[PDB]
């Protein structure tokens, strides 16, 4: 029931190092990563482990912070907006699959609040 995880390396994809990407790794991702509610999001959803064969029938663009962290560390992105889009995919997937007030949604909402806080002053 688990698809192959999102790629974290792609040799023919063009890459750039920017100050915004460095901040997304050093500040934004590490602050989220340490948060008490981060653990569900530190790796792809394991639908076999969870016995949720429906998960990847609903969520067609999966994304997790373990993938985003590996992408940042491997210099996968062209620009910060591509990374921010991955974070937003992750949050949105959580809101789509689950229902308002679910524990997992409270977790995602807390992380997203912190995320928007940290990106409120991206560098230049
Ligand atoms: C809702 C839950 C199934 N959830 C989820 C689970 C995990 N991992 C995990 N591992 C062991 C036990 C559990 C677990 C069991 N029961 C209730 C829970 C309530 C709140 C958190 C976790 C729970 N969850 C990882 C990611 C997700 N994401 C992002 C989702 O959107 C859905 C698919």
Q: Is the CB of 38 under 6 A from ligand 1?
A: no
The separation between the first and the last C-alpha atoms of the chain, rounded to the nearest angstrom, is 42
Alpha-carbon span 70 to 12, nearest angstrom: 17
Alpha-carbon span 7 to 25, nearest angstrom: 18
Pocket test for ligand 1, best of 50, 51, 94, 102 (most atoms within 8 A of CB): 50
Alpha-carbon span 100 to 48, nearest angstrom: 24
At how many Å resolution was this determined? 1.8
Give domain limits for the chain: 18-122
Ligand 1 atom nearest to 94, measured from its CA:
31
* Distance from the alpha carbon of residue 47 to the mean position of ligand 1, in angstroms: 10
Q: Shortest CA distance to 91 belongs to which of 69, 113, 67?
A: 113
Q: Is the CB of 92 under 6 A from ligand 1?
A: no
Question: Which residues lie below 8 Å from residue 19, measured CB to CB, with a gap of 6+?
Answer: 123, 124
Which of left, alpha, beta for 9 (phi over 0: left; psi -120 to 50: alpha)? beta
* Distance from the alpha carbon of residue 40 to the mean position of ligand 1, in angstroms: 6
Ligand 1 atom nearest to 59, measured from its CA:
31
């Amino acid at each position: 029931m688990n698809p192959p995880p999102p790629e974290t390396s792609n040799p023919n994809k063009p890459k750039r190092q920017t100050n915004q990407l460095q901040y997304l790794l050093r500040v934004v991702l590490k602050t989220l990563w340490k948060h008490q509610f981060a653990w569900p999001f530190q790796q792809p959803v394991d639908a076999v482990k969870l016995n949720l064969p429906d998960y990847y029938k609903i969520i067609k663009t999966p994304m997790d912070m373990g993938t985003i962290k590996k992408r940042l560390e491997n210099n996968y992105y062209w620009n910060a907006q591509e990374c921010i889009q991955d974070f937003n995919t992750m949050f949105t997937n959580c809101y789509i699959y689950n229902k308002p007030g679910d524990d997992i949604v409270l977790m995602a909402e807390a992380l997203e609040k912190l995320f928007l806080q940290k990106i409120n002053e991206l560098p230049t």
